[PDB]
Structure formats: C-alpha cells, structure tokens
Steps between C-alpha positions, in 0.01 A plus 500: 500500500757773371376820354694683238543873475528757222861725536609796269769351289660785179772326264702749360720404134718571208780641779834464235785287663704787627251610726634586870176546634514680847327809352254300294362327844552854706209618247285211509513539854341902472222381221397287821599285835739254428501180709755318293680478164736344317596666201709308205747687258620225331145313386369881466169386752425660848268333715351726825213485723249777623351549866138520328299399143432841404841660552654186282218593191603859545892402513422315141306773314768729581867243417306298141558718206747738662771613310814677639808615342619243220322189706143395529339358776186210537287393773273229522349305787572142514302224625558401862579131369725710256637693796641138675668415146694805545550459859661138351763491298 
C-alpha cells in the first residue's frame, strides 16, 4: 500500500562540451528554488529539481527556446520513469 507522488522535475539540453557550468546553475537557481542539480558539460544535458510544480513549468517556459550569445538553449520535462534513466547510468 505505497502511494506515489507528483515532483517538479525541468531537463535542461544542447549545453556544448566545454561548458563549465557554475554560472549556468547560479541562474537556474534565481529563475526558482533549487533543491538539487547536476549539470553535465560533456553529454550537453542538465538535470535539476524544483521545490514546487508551478515554479518548475515557469522555470521551462522561460530556459526552451532561449537563445544567448552564439549558443541556444532547450528545455523539456522528462518523464519521472525518464528521470530514474538519467539518475542511472
């Protein structure tokens, strides 16, 4: 008799290889609450997690389709099975 519940979850991609990525969590952080991340430079994926399910939506609006200076950036929000897979390696 286990119940399951729902957590924000906002996968962020297409990060090139030479990303050091201290400032690119630091701002993910400020779009909202960050209770962990591990961000990737070398596979180009971030994976973080949001306190609550309407400051991840917000978080994803805001990162998919945002382009900076000479790089573009992509969010999407993965399944939570998804989320294990990446959890796995």
């Amino acid at each position: 008799g286990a119940m399951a519940w729902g957590s924000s979850w906002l996968l962020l991609k297409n990060l090139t290889a030479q990303i050091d990525g201290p400032t690119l969590r630091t701002l993910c952080m400020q779009h909202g609450p960050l209770v962990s991340f591990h961000p990737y430079l070398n596979q180009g994926i971030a994976l973080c997690k949001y306190t609550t399910r309407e400051e991840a939506n917000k978080a994803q609006m805001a990162l998919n389709n945002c382009v900076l200076a000479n790089t573009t950036i992509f969010a999407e929000s993965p399944s939570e099975n998804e989320v294990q897979s990446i959890m796995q390696h």
